[PDB]
């Protein structure tokens, strides 16, 4: 939220360079479920986690793709079964 | 293998440039493999596992990590390690009525049933009590051909 708050300053690039190497581990995270079915977390600190299979737990961002990542990460384990 | 790491470690501390943080960050592959293995010795230890039973548990932890495949490779080698006298143990029950069963922690066990039903084939003794099963010394994964296989 800091980063759409001030752009238009010259602090634009101090902010731009912590965010980009602050958001790397969550964008490292979602590279590894999608495309290989296993997850990972730091502390379960990030919400989101994981017969008929679907009886698995799930306990800004562009939330518009945030819960699709939840169905995205369990159809490939099941698909590595 | 691990002597071998430290060994480099050794020449490189020796030519006045290593740091605590280089060393840091050099160990933690090698943390991986030995938190692996002690994790695996401990599981095995406790329940007092071998036979089969040791070979269930390397199928499912065979399993379970295959997110980095660093340590995926390790317990794929070692699962094919451990089964390799399973396998020829199997093979021969297969291919051959003869088996000699150096240690008892083969799936099949053979008790004489010959000292009761003797000279006859009027019990139908092999298929009852005399060629059983033994259930948990089955590794898990040939438990879909069972029957078969006796």
């Given at each position: 939220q800091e980063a759409l708050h001030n752009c238009s300053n010259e602090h634009y690039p101090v902010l731009l360079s912590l965010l980009k190497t602050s958001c790397e581990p969550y964008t490292r995270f979602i590279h590894d479920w999608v495309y290989s079915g296993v997850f990972r977390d730091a502390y379960g600190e990030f919400?989101?986690?994981?017969?008929?299979?679907?009886?698995?737990?799930?306990?800004?961002?562009?939330?518009?793709?945030?819960?699709?990542?939840?169905?995205?990460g369990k159809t490939i384990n099941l698909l590595k079964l | 293998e691990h002597?071998?790491?430290?060994?480099?470690?050794?020449?490189?501390?020796?030519?006045?440039?290593?740091?605590?943080?280089?060393?840091?960050?050099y160990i933690q592959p090698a943390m991986r493999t030995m938190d692996i293995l002690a994790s695996l010795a401990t599981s095995v230890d406790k329940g007092e596992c071998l036979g089969g039973?040791?070979?269930?548990?390397?199928?499912?932890?065979?399993?379970?990590?295959?997110?980095?495949?660093?340590?995926?490779?390790?317990?794929?080698?070692?699962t094919k390690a451990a089964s390799a006298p399973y396998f020829e143990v199997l093979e021969?029950?297969?291919?051959r009525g003869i088996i000699h069963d150096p240690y008892s922690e083969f799936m099949v066990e053979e008790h004489?049933?010959?000292?009761?039903?003797?000279?006859?084939?009027?019990?139908?003794?092999?298929?009852?009590?005399?060629?059983?099963?033994?259930?948990?010394?089955?590794?898990?994964?040939?438990?879909?051909?069972?029957?078969k296989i006796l």
């Open positions: 919400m989101i986690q994981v017969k008929l299979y679907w009886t698995h737990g799930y306990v800004v961002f562009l939330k518009h793709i945030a819960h699709d990542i939840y169905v995205c | 002597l071998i790491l430290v060994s480099q470690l050794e020449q490189l501390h020796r030519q006045g440039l290593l740091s605590l943080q280089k060393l840091w960050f039973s040791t070979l269930s548990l390397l199928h499912d932890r065979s399993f379970s990590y295959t997110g980095d495949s660093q340590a995926q490779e390790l317990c794929l080698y070692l021969k029950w297969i291919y004489e049933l010959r000292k009761e039903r003797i000279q006859e084939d009027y019990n139908d003794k092999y298929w009852d009590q005399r060629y059983t099963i033994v259930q948990q010394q089955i590794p898990s994964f040939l438990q879909k051909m069972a029957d």
